[PDB]
Amino acid sequence: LPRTVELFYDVLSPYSWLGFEILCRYQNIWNINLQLRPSLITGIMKDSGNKPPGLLPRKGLYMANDLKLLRHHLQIPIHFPKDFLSVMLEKGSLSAMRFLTAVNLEHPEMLEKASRELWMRVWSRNEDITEPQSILAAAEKAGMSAEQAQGLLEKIATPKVKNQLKETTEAACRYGAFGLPITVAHVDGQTHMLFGSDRMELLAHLLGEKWMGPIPPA
């Protein structure tokens, strides 16, 4: 039976995008059932008493250099902006994550593509992801029709959508999250929580699967 792997992420998290692309490349290679869980990193940080690593000068500088190298190693078009702290702390990703939650509730088959497009806007093209038109553009590029995207956008402020995002974020905390991304592997009645996009080789080991690098063949 395929092992269930849960990935908690926020589009505001560049490292979550990296982990997400690696798991998506392996979802049809490894015997796993990938379940995407849109969460709010702000909620996780507040609950754990943690703070964004970029607030400390040297860590912020390191992130920039690290992401620059990972762009080539992982072959993910990430272009980290110099004013990333403003993007993270001043703008945020509330509407975007509420939108992805609505997508997960009514059109889950579109969640992977819709998520990738939002990440592409904020961390690849340095485009806005807080305004309605911005989210609509991302949704349409993901394949949704103007009508579908519009219908979902109208529900981002409904109690059902808000409560679902809150619950998913709380589930991450219950697993012990202090940041994102976190991957939860359910292997033979055992649950393992791994933090970071750099624990995938360890995940392979736990699953008894073969690690073939961040870019597996075929």
Ligand X SMILES: N[C@@H](CCC(=O)N[C@@H](CS(=O)O)C(=O)NCC(=O)O)C(=O)O
The verdict on whether residue 86 carries a ligand-binding annotation is: no
Q: Which two tokens stand for residue 41?
A: 């990193």
Among its own copies, ligand X, none, residue 69 binds (CB under 5-8 Å by kind): its own copies
The verdict on whether residue 13 carries a ligand-binding annotation is: yes
Distances (CA, A) of 53 to 33, 41, 58: 31, 12, 9
The verdict on whether residue 180 carries a ligand-binding annotation is: yes
Q: Which stretch binds ligand X (CB under 6 A): 102-110, 123-131, 148-156, 193-201?
A: 193-201
Q: Does 89 bind its own copies (CB under 8 A)?
A: no
Q: Does 39 bind ligand X (CB under 6 A)?
A: no
Q: Which two tokens stand for residue 189?
A: 């009645």
Nearest to 196 by CA among 21, 15, 75, 42: 15
3-class DSSP state of 19: helix
Q: Select the residue interacting with its own copies from 57, 159, 189, 217 (CB under 8 A).
A: 57
Q: Does 61 bind its own copies (CB under 8 A)?
A: yes
Q: Which residues contact 95 (CB under 8 A, 6 or more apart)?
A: 129, 130, 132, 135, 156
Q: Which stretch binds its own copies (CB under 8 A): 34-42, 57-65, 93-101, 153-161?
A: 57-65
Q: Select the residue interacting with ligand X from 11, 78, 180, 184 (CB under 6 A).
A: 180
The verdict on whether residue 23 carries a ligand-binding annotation is: no
Pairing mode, strands 32-38 and 3-9: parallel
What does the DSSP assignment read for 142-174? HT--HHHHHHHHTTTTSHHHHHHHHHHHHHHHH
Q: Select the residue interacting with ligand X from 3, 6, 11, 15 (CB under 6 A).
A: 15
3 half-sphere exposure, CB direction, 13 A CA radius: 22
Q: Select the residue interacting with ligand X from 32, 95, 135, 179 (CB under 6 A).
A: 179
Q: Select the residue interacting with ligand X from 197, 200, 203, 207 (CB under 6 A).
A: 197
Site size for its own copies (CB under 8 A): 32
Q: Euclidean distance between the first and final Cα of the chain, in Å?
A: 23
**Binding footprint of its own copies on the chain (CB under 8 A):** 48-50, 56-59, 61-62, 65-66, 69-70, 72-73, 176-178, 192-196, 198-199, 201-202, 205-206, 211, 213-214
Q: Which residues are annotated as a binding site for glutathione?
A: 13-15, 50, 180, 197-198
